[PDB]
């Protein structure tokens, strides 16, 4: 909790929020990111699979706030019908589409239109590895709209047996609520890391500071492996920045 106590963190956030108001070029910048300089190489190849960091104290977003796109295994008749009928998930998804239909309908410039319309993309884990070919480069560089893996039902796969295909609406809604409130990170085989911690004009400075400490604790705690505890050997320095603002230091070793 030393980071929150340190005044350096508060002043930088005050400077960052203020100068976004002042500078026109940063007018479209809305999210707050922290840049973490790990001492040693993580050694994890970037799998493009988001890793959720639980933020206990505060919730970044709710499902009702964001455009959510669900990509399902073909055929989507069962999942679309079950989700659209159940009251809990009736109004949860902006659009439900299958992989084959997504590939056929959207190509080229249409992929850019899909990128803008949707704030969050979620996909069945079975079809996640196919998406990089389909969605294109734009979704898969930068990590702003990187798809999230979700599981339709609590059924499990057993070798030499066929999984029963079912859709559990309450489980899907529960996963999506967790995805929105909890921030996410992607491992890479280099020191630098970027994690979203706050949203300008929604989160106060004390809340963003708490989110940062939650991120640091989860990422450093070896007990939380394999999802957490990826930052071995401590953190050399931590910065704060928006998408187009530079790194303002908040901690240095």
């Amino acid at each position: 909790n030393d980071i929150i106590k340190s005044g350096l963190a508060e002043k930088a956030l005050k400077a960052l929020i203020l100068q976004c108001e002042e500078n026109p070029s940063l007018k479209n910048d809305k999210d707050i990111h922290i840049i973490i300089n790990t001492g040693k190489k993580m050694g994890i190849n970037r799998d493009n699979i988001p890793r959720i960091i639980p933020l206990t104290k505060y919730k970044l977003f709710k499902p009702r706030d964001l455009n959510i796109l669900l990509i399902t295994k073909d055929p989507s008749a069962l999942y679309r019908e079950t989700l659209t009928k159940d009251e809990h998930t009736s109004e949860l998804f902006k659009e439900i589409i299958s992989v084959k239909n997504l590939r056929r309908r959207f190509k080229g410039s249409k992929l850019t239109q899909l990128y803008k319309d949707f704030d969050l993309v979620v996909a069945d884990y079975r079809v996640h590895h196919l998406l990089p070919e389909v969605l294109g480069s734009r979704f898969y560089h930068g990590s702003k709209k990187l798809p999230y893996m979700i599981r339709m039902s609590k059924e499990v796969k057993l070798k030499r047996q066929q999984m029963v295909e079912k859709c559990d609406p309450i489980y899907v809604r529960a996963q999506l609520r967790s995805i929105c409130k909890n921030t996410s990170y992607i491992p890479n085989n280099d020191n630098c890391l970027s994690v979203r911690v706050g949203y300008i004009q929604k989160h106060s400075i004390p809340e963003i500071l708490q989110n940062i400490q939650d991120t640091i604790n989860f990422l450093t705690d070896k007990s939380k492996r394999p999802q957490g505890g990826v930052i071995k050997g401590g953190i050399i320095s931590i910065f704060v920045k928006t998408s187009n603002s530079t790194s303002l230091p908040i901690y240095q070793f």
Partner: peptide, 24 residues
């Protein structure tokens, strides 16, 4: 929860708690 076909499942699966299941 693990799936042999897709090793990526066990990392980066959304944690689910009692608060999530409970209706708003």
């Amino acid at each position: 929860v693990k799936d042999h076909r897709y090793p990526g499942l066990t990392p980066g699966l959304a944690p689910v708690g009692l608060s999530d299941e409970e209706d708003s």
